Design a binder for this molecule. Structure first.
Ligand code: NA
Length: 314
């Protein structure tokens, strides 16, 4: 099975570099006992590496665990390692093994955009969202252009922030390799952020979708974070949400709040219903919203720290 060969092939490549953490410009030999457990994050554990004091995120892959779940963890790990040089994607410090487990050390961030939304109990400021848009669109473009990967789960819980003001994309466990710029897997992703063409393919003989589906998910995420509410929150079921995505006009930023013209334009472009007219990432990167925020000095770090200091855990 070519699925079996590449999975063991990738596993071998990773096992060759196991037994050490590269953190702070130094390579350290590493075992489970070198790591103090500090509790789960709803398996992903927050752990202190005793040799340096760094607090990290630790994923646990079981030998006797769910086969589909271990495939996702290996897929996520593979994409993370390949994406080392992209600064908008979380970093892995290394792996180490027991007889029964593979532990994976990841960069601990502060929190996700979904949790920030809950802490804010309202909007995240346009200036933060502008930096976020730049970062996430560059991460997704990087995955597409350099690895032929479609993320398939762009949503606020996968956008991370830290106290240094970095914004990064994470969780590629359901990411797919594109074939001729197309993906086939119709079950991969969260229903609420699905584009119209993924819910109901316009051509039932050619049902496959591409990165433009993720562009829609980005748009929905931006409206959600900019207003403090998921646009279809008052739908009583997932089936109702999807029915509205199909039948109604797309959500927009509401004009009465005074969002800048270029942000309104960007969201409106991302939320073009007809996927043939929806821009790809290379076109989004030319958008004046992005150009404005690429160069703009925004103190995301101070804003982040202030929010985390002033609010309770959701
Ligand atoms: Na990276």
């Amino acid at each position: 099975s070519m699925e079996s060969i590449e999975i063991d092939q990738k596993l071998q490549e990773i096992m060759k570099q196991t037994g050490y953490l590269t953190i702070g410009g130094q390579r350290y030999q590493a075992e489970i006992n070198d790591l103090e457990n500090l509790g789960e994050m709803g398996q992903v554990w927050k752990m202190r590496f005793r040799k340096t004091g760094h607090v990290i995120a630790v994923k646990q892959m079981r030998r006797s665990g769910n086969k589909e779940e271990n495939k996702r963890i290996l897929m996520d790990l593979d994409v993370v390692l390949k994406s080392h040089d992209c600064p908008y994607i979380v970093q892995c410090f290394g792996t180490f093994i027991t007889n029964t487990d593979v532990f994976i050390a990841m960069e601990l961030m502060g929190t996700c955009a979904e949790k920030l939304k809950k802490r804010m109990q309202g909007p995240i400021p346009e200036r933060i969202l502008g930096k976020m848009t730049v970062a996430i669109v560059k991460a997704l473009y990087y995955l597409k252009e350099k690895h032929g990967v479609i993320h398939r789960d762009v949503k606020p819980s996968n956008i991370l922030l830290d106290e240094r003001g970095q914004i990064k994309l994470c969780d590629f466990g359901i990411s797919g390799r594109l074939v001729d710029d197309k993906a086939k897997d119709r079950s991969a992703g969260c229903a609420a952020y699905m584009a119209p063409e993924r819910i109901d393919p316009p051509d039932p003989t050619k049902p496959d979708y591409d990165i433009r589906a993720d562009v829609w998910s980005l748009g929905i995420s931006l409206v959600e974070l900019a207003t403090g509410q998921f646009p279809y929150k008052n739908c009583k079921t997932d089936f109702e949400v999807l029915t509205k995505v199909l039948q109604e006009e797309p959500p927009l930023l509401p004009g009465h709040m005074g969002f800048s013209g270029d942000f309104q334009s960007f969201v409106k472009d991302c939320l073009t219903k007809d996927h043939r007219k929806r821009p790809k990432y290379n076109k989004l990167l030319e958008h004046s919203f992005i150009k404005r925020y690429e160069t703009l000095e925004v103190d995301v770090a101070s804003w982040f720290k202030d929010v985390m200091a002033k609010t309770e855990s959701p």
